[PDB]
């Protein structure tokens, strides 16, 4: 995309996140999802 945002983002969160969920997720929806909005 030539008109994709070409600016830098130094304002992203620079902290570490050890507090995210460390559990495995085996019962997440394993089906294919071709019905998601394919537009921009």
């Amino acid at each position: 995309n030539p008109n994709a945002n070409p600016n830098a983002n130094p304002n992203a969160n620079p902290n570490a996140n050890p507090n995210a969920n460390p559990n495995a997720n085996p019962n997440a929806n394993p089906n294919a999802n071709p019905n998601a909005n394919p537009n921009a």
Partner: antibody
Amino acid sequence: QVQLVESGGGVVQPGGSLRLSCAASGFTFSGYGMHWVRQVPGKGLEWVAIIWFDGSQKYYADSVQGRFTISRDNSKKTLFLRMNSLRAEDTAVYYCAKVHDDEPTQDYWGQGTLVTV
Amino acid sequence: DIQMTQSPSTLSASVGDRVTITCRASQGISTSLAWYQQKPGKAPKLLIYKASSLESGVPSRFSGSGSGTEFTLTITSLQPEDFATYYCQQYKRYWTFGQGTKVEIK
């Protein structure tokens, strides 16, 4: 206080080469994208090329594809456009341009130089 | 690329008047079209981005709206410093500019 200046203009023979420069100041040039927009006087504008902030990506118009090279030098806050195999139709007023923060539009244009063949 | 057209290409008005400029293009966008101003011999400066929002430093007199392929610029209480050639632009694809419309003194 976005200050943009352009140099390297003048007259060149057809088929020759010329090299433009765009010094920048008043903003973090190291992290912003750059544009080159040219204007044939008495007519409308036509976009030339875009260079990403880091310099990895770069695009051009079809009429200028394969002949014009856009480059950056983040150390000295200067934007270049290497111009090769110039022709009579390329004579126009060339402008340096600044990418907006929100959408990839152009906000501030330098005074620009006139290139003649 | 996107094809850009403006109408009328030249308009005449006095001070304190109310003027519109129509920007018509193919390749339906509805979101991303600009507005500009270019004094003769001067570099262009941005006036309206996202076709509805003003850039900082632009007075409240300038206003733009539209969706689809119909886009317009509204100028109320016309002032002497506004007499220039207002251009048009879009970003949804490779950038292309319009032909340019100039507002004159009536």
